[PDB]
């Protein structure tokens, strides 16, 4: 079926939970043996969210190459994304090592450091120009260059330096600051505006390594971001935009990381975002 009318048909029939459970039943199951080794227990935020072995990002380190992060490679859309958990106190250095080694231009953050009175990820970037951060375990230096605070999101320019080689690179930090502590946004308008700002920067484009995107577990809000982006790109590329099937795209993405889209409300919000976004594109 088309999307917008499939949408109203699920609303009128109130069957979002049944649709979402079908997706969960059909989703791929692949091994995640490296994630479950005992030496990696303090590298995982949640015991039930792990990268598959076949698609995990490997750190270029011979001691321990493990990080909780996955490469989502979308062949028809010609887009790649790295989805990862919010860094932990003992993985902030690994996180920036991955950004360096994978040649990423942008980092997309969809959570606040504290939500619901608890810490959802480490404070992993510097908050003042004159107070830089040094990660001694991976030999990197990170400096805040500039910060632009808007009503729904903040964009930061950062300098990442590899202290071994003295090479430097400019990284863009796109921080969506207004996702609610509970539920999903009422309108997709500010989320779509944010996605378009990431696109305009070049961070999603083939001349760079894959964008790094995260929330707390790296599957819920993070899944909504890449699902909407890929669906809109396919609607531009195909002769028949109504052929784009958001459930099929989501199942394709779940071949590469488990659990993408965590609730039926996130599924409905993803439909809404793609529907509204397709009208603005034209
Ligand atoms: F991936 C995308 C492709 C195009 C747009 C177009 N757009 C830009 N700003 C918007 C605000 C509200 C609604 C739509 C919008 C967005 C995302």
Q: Which CA distances in Å does 47 have to 37, 51, 57, 86, 223?
A: 12, 11, 18, 14, 19
d(CA 233, CA 242): 13
Residue 185 main-chain phi, psi, to 5 deg: -60, 150
Provide the angle, in degrees to the nearest 10, between the axes of the packed helices 16-26 and 264-281: 100
DSSP conformation class of 263: S
Pocket test for ligand 1, best of 195, 234, 282 (most atoms within 8 A of CB): 195
Quoted resolution (Å): 1.8
**Residue 215 to residue 217: CA distance in whole angstroms:** 6
d(CA 176, CA 154): 7
Task: Give me the residue label for tokens 């899944």.
Answer: 223
Beta bridge partners of 213: 83, 108
Whose tokens are 């796109």? That residue is 174
Is the distance from CB of 226 to CB of 204 less than 8 angstroms?
no
Compute CA distances 232 → 42, 80, 94, whole Å.
37, 14, 32
Contact 105, 211 (CB under 8 A): yes
CA dist., res. 137 & res. 278, Å (int): 45
Domains in the chain and their CATH numbers? Answer: 1-282 (3.90.190.10)
Q: Distance between CA 135 and CA 97 in Å, rounded?
A: 9
Q: Is 215 a catalytic residue?
A: yes
Q: Is the CB of 193 under 6 A from ligand 1?
A: yes
Is the CB–ligand 1 distance for residue 189 below 6 Å?
A: yes
Q: Which two tokens stand for residue 41?
A: 């227990």
DSSP character at residue 59: P
Q: Is 9 helix (H, G, I), strand (E, B) or coil?
A: helix
Tell me, using a 6 A CB cutoff, whether residue 232 lines ligand 1.
Answer: yes
| Nearest residue to 156 (alpha-carbon basis) of 177, 143, 132, 172 | 172
Cα-to-chain-centroid distance, residue 208: 16
Q: What are phi and psi of 118, to 5 degrees?
A: -135, 160
Distances (CA, A) of 71 to 1, 74, 185, 249, 257: 30, 10, 27, 15, 8
Q: Helix or strand or coil: residue 214?
A: strand
Helix (H, G, I), strand (E, B) or coil at 99: helix
Counting ligand 1 atoms within 8 A of each CB, the residue from 74, 150, 188, 192 with the most, and so the one to mutate, is 192
241 secondary structure, DSSP code: G
If we measure between CA atoms, which residue out of 242, 209, 245, 205 comes closest to residue 227?
245
Degrees, nearest 5: CA angle 70-102-254: 20
* Closest of 258, 256, 188, 252 to residue 225, by C-alpha: 188
């Amino acid at each position: 079926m088309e999307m917008e009318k499939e949408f109203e048909q699920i609303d009128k029939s109130g069957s979002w939970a049944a649709i979402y459970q079908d997706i969960r039943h059909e989703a791929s199951d692949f091994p995640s043996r490296v994630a479950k080794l005992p030496k990696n227990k303090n590298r995982n935020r949640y015991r039930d969210v792990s990268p598959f072995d076949h698609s995990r990002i490997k750190l270029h380190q011979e001691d321990n190459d493990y990080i909780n992060a996955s490469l989502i490679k979308m062949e028809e859309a010609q887009r790649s994304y790295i989805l990862t958990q919010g860094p932990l106190p003992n993985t902030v250095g690994h996180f920036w090592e991955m950004v360096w080694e994978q040649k990423s231009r942008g980092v997309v953050m969809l959570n606040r450091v504290m939500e619901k009175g608890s810490l959802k990820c480490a404070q992993y970037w510097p908050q003042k120009e004159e107070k830089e951060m040094i990660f001694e375990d991976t030999n990197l230096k990170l400096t805040l260059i500039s910060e632009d605070i808007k009503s729904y999101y903040t964009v930061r320019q950062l300098e990442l330096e590899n202290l071994t080689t003295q090479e430097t690179r400019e990284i863009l930090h796109f921080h969506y600051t207004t996702w609610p502590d509970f539920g999903v946004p009422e309108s997709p308008a500010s989320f779509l505006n944010f996605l378009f700002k990431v696109r305009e920067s070049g961070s999603l484009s083939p001349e760079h390594g894959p964008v790094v995107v995260h929330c707390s577990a790296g599957i819920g809000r993070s899944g909504t971001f890449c699902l909407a982006d890929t669906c809109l790109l396919l609607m531009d590329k195909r002769k028949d935009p109504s052929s784009v099937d958001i459930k099929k795209v989501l199942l394709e993405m779940r071949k590469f990381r488990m659990g993408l889209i965590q609730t039926a409300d996130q599924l409905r919000f993803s439909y809404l975002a793609v529907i509204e976004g397709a009208k603005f594109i034209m």
